[PDB]
Every structure is written in C-alpha cells, then in structure tokens.
Write a protein that binds this ligand. Structure first.
Ligand code: NA
Lengths: 9, 142, 410
C-alpha cells in the first residue's frame, strides 16, 4: 500500500 | 549636434539633439516642421532648465517608480510642480509627466478630505446634505 | 503661490485626462476621500470613470480579482473601450465595496471552514485509490491505483475519458494546453494528447517506480524509487532527450520541483537536495527532517516540505535554514501546496490542514496561531491536493476526489 512514496528507514 | 530651444521669455538653450528629442513635441517640430530654433511659447526658462536637467539625468530614460534623484528633483513648491506637469504634457515627455503625476497622487494618498483641502487650499462646496450622503456611501473603507 | 488644486486646475487648462491619471494611482480608501474634497474632484472621478479603471487595475494585478471577475461575470463590464450599453461610473463605484464584501466572506469561509463539498467516487476496478490529480475551470485529471487515468467534467462531475496503458498505478501526472505526462509503478513516463488521449511518447529509463515529475519551458524532471532524478530537454511531445542523471539520494526520490534557478529533490533518506537548473550540478543539502519526506513545493526562496515525522518545514533555499516547523498532523504529511496566503497539507489520517503562511514565516507568531482549520471528510490517506483562492480539490486512498468550495457555499 502507498506505491507513491518510500522511506529508507 | 546641438539645437536651439527658445523659452517663452526669449532665452535660447543649445541642447544635444539626442536629449532634446526625449520631448516628442520637440522631435516633431525638428523632424516634420524643420523648426530652428524651436519656440516654446508655453514653457519659460526657469522650467525649461528643470526639464533639460531631468532629460539629461535620465540620459537613458529610466524612471521606474520615483527613483531617489527624481524625489529630490521634485522637492519644489506645488506652483513649480504644476508648471512642470504643464510643460511635460506640452513637450510630450511621458516619464516626466508620469513622475510629476505620481508625486501629486502621493500628496493625496492616506489623508481625510479635510486634510487634502488644507494641502491644496480647496473650499468644501458640498451641502451638509450631499456630504452626509457620500460619507455614508464610502464608510465601508473605514 | 505655494498651493495649486491640481485636480481643478488641469480641467481648467482643458487637461482633464492628466487629473484622471493622477487619481488613477490612488487606492480605494484614498479615492473615496478625493470624492469628498469638493464637487469638481467628485466630477473628475465620476466622468474619468476612475472606479471602473481601479477595478481593472485590481484585475490586472490580483488573480483573486481576476477570478471573481469571471466567476461573478462582472468581467463582461470591464475593458471594451466604448460604453455600448454604457454601465455608468455610479455602477462601478457601487460594485467595488461589493467585491470587497465578497472577498471578506470568502476569507471568512476558509477561516471558519464553511464550504460546499462534492464527492466523486472514482469507482476503481480492483485496486482502490487516487494517487495524483490536477484541475482547471473545465476539468479534473486524476491517476489511479488501477493503472487508469480518469478525466472528470469540472461542473457535472461526469467521467469524460479513461486512458489505459500503464501496467502499474499512475503515481504522478501534470498536463498543459497540449499534453498529459504520467509516471507509474511500471517505471515508464507516458506523454498523452490532452484531447484525443492518444499516447504520443513513452520514456523507458527508470529501473523502478517513477514517483514524481514536473515539466515547464521545454524541460522535464523525473524522479524514481531507483533513487535517481532524470533531467530531459522537452522540445515537443515526441522530441524528448535525456540531458543528465543526478544520483544523490540514499533512498527513493519521492518528489521533485524546479524553476529557472534550482531543481529541488526530496527523498525517503530524510534530505532535500538543491541542484543548478542550468548546470545540473549539486548545490546544497537541506537536512533536518527526522524521517522520510513524502511531499514538497518550491517557489522563490521558499521550500515547504512534509515528512513521515508528522511535521511540515519551511526552508530558505539560499542558506538552507529551516524558518518554521509546523506541528499538528497526527500522521505522515503526504501532500502539500501553498500560495502567498496559505499552506494546505494532507496527511495519512485523511485530515487536511490549512495554515497561515505569512504567520508561519513571522518567527514571533506562536504555533498556536498557525493552523487556521482542520478539514475531515476523507476516510483514507490523502495522496494529493490542489487549491486556489476559492477551493481545494483533494484525492485519497478512499477512492474519492473531494471538491471543497469556499465561494459557492450554502
Ligand atoms: Na551528494
């Protein structure tokens, strides 16, 4: 879910 | 070259043609009418000096708003300022006409009608009736 | 003689128009004062058509006045040189205060969060949600998780087209007079004809989902989960060449903006990076966010950003200093825009916030005063919004587009 953004954690 | 301008009161000024032609009126008189000298029955020496000065100092006519030079140049009595507006219009010098006009506008902005009247020596010629009517109509901006 | 009534003296010289030009500089409040100075001043203002002229000067400068002129249709009384039907000065004099009233009730609507709400169900196929949108007077174009682009009639809210082709979610889009441009989970950028909906070009380049793009003045920038930014010369819809690849971020590049001076990238790696638009060389990093950055807008000196840390930050791009932190969203800040008056943010909890921008930039202003309103009508993450002087349009995981109207309120 949410393909529009990514983090890096 | 230089070219002769003739004040209302007889005095001649030899002005660089490039500077003189900042005045469209003068451009037309030189180019379409072959006038030499160029009579200015509407403009006296006093004011004509001030105008040449203004055109000289605007060598490259940059009147953005009121630049600092123009402000000090225009620190003259209302009488002179008026004579400058008349001359600007007579010579068709847009930039000079524009600064002189914005200068009077600035003498009007941010004042009560009464304050404005005292500035320019104007008599209130409104009935107390007519006045109440407008005061009411305009009260939205206070 | 030290005093001269310019506004009387010029008409006496036959030079009415000059006196009019003088008065044409005055703001409404001063113009009202001038009317009251004496009958000749009132006469010059009245016959010089000074109120029509002022209204035109407001329309030519303030887009708000432009907007209202159209939506209210008093634009049809402006310009057009000769009277014709000849609405008299009295009319334009009466109108100015009615426009001001109009304007104040609009601002009041924003402040008190009075609006007309219209809800488009995008009736998505399997996958639900609306990742991106853009609108104008005539239409709303939207990108969906079901891989489709849908175009909506702005007035009727009917669906006019459904463009298909992407093999993954449509994550970003932008359109102009000529084209629509989209990035997908499928790693492609597609250029479509904004009218025929015909595919004009497909850019193969990013190895991973294309998360954001922007194009202007024959330049396009794309940014991807692959951690890269691509810069393109965009001669036409069909003549689009890769100028440079900027590799820089340690994680997904979620968003990209730019102008003449600077390209601005923001990333899951918690950084904003600034690059020369002309040289494509790196300039500076803007670090400070405690978590990934999901959204950003750049204009003038100001970068505004929303993070997975639940904050919004305002930055100066020249020294990279954070001017303001905005706290209040209880979840990730997933979309954000601003104009001169405000910031509008959307968050993962489906809430939208409206912020006093000028107050945010006044370091004296308390946090207390900064959030004007919280708008709660979405039932899912907010993926995108656009707003203007009169409305917000927002899209969401809940598979809806919402139009919030602060003008036509009931
Ligand atoms: Na770097």
């Amino acid at each position: 879910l949410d393909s529009g953004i990514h983090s890096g954690a | 070259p230089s070219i002769k301008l003739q004040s209302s009161d007889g005095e001649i000024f030899e002005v660089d043609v490039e500077i003189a032609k900042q005045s469209v009126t003068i451009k037309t008189m030189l180019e379409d009418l072959g006038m030499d000298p160029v009579p200015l029955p509407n403009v006296n020496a006093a004011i004509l000096k001030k105008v040449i000065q203004w055109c000289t100092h605007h060598k490259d006519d940059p009147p953005d708003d009121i630049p600092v030079w123009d402000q000090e140049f225009l620190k003259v009595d209302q009488g002179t300022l008026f004579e400058l507006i008349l001359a600007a219009n007579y010579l068709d010098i847009k930039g000079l006409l524009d600064v002189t006009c914005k200068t009077v506008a600035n003498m009007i902005k941010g004042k009560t009608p009464e304050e404005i009247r005292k500035t320019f020596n104007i008599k209130n010629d409104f009935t107390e009736e007519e006045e109440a009517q407008v005061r009411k109509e305009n009260q939205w901006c206070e | 003689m030290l005093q001269r009534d310019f506004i009387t003296a010029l008409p006496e010289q036959g030079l009415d128009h000059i006196a009019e030009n003088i008065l044409s500089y005055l703001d409404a409040r001063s113009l009202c004062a001038a009317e009251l100075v004496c009958k000749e001043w009132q006469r010059v203002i009245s016959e010089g058509m000074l109120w029509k002229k002022l209204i035109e000067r407001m329309v030519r400068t303030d887009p708000l006045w432009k907007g209202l002129s159209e939506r209210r249709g008093w634009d049809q009384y402006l310009f057009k040189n000769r009277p014709t039907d000849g609405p008299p000065n009295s009319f334009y004099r009466s109108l100015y205060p009615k426009i001001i009233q109009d304007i104040e009730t609009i601002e009041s609507n924003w402040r008190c969060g009075r609006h007309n709400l219209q809800r488009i169900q995008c009736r998505s196929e399997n996958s639900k949600g609306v990742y991106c949108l853009q609108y104008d007077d005539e239409k709303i174009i939207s990108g969906l998780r079901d891989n489709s682009i849908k175009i909506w009639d702005k007035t009727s809210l009917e669906c006019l087209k459904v463009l298909t082709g992407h093999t993954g979610s449509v994550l970003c889009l932008q359109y102009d007079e000529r084209v629509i441009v989209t990035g997908s989970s499928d790693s492609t950028v597609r250029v479509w004809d904004v009218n025929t909906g015909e595919v004009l070009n497909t850019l193969i380049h990013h190895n991973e989902a294309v998360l954001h793009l922007r194009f202007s003045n024959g330049l396009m920038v794309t940014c991807s989960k692959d951690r890269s930014i691509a810069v393109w010369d965009m001669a036409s819809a069909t003549d689009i060449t890769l100028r440079r690849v900027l590799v820089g971020h340690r994680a997904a590049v979620n968003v990209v903006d730019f102008d003449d001076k600077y390209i601005v990238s923001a990333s899951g790696d918690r950084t904003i990076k600034v690059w020369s638009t002309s040289t494509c060389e790196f300039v500076r990093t803007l670090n400070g966010h405690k978590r990934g950055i999901a959204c950003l807008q750049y204009r003038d000196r100001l970068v505004v950003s929303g993070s997975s840390d639940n904050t919004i930050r305002l930055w100066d791009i020249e020294c990279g200093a954070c001017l303001r932190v905005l706290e209040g969203h209880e979840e990730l800040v997933r979309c954000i825009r601003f104009d001169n008056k405000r910031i509008v943010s959307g968050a993962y909890d489906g809430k939208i916030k409206v912020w006093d921008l000028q107050a945010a930039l006044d370091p004296r202003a308390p946090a207390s005063t900064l959030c004007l309103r919280t708008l709660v009508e979405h039932s899912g993450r907010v993926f995108r919004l656009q707003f203007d002087e009169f409305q917000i349009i927002s899209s969401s995981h809940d598979d809806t587009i919402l139009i919030w109207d602060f003008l036509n309120v009931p």
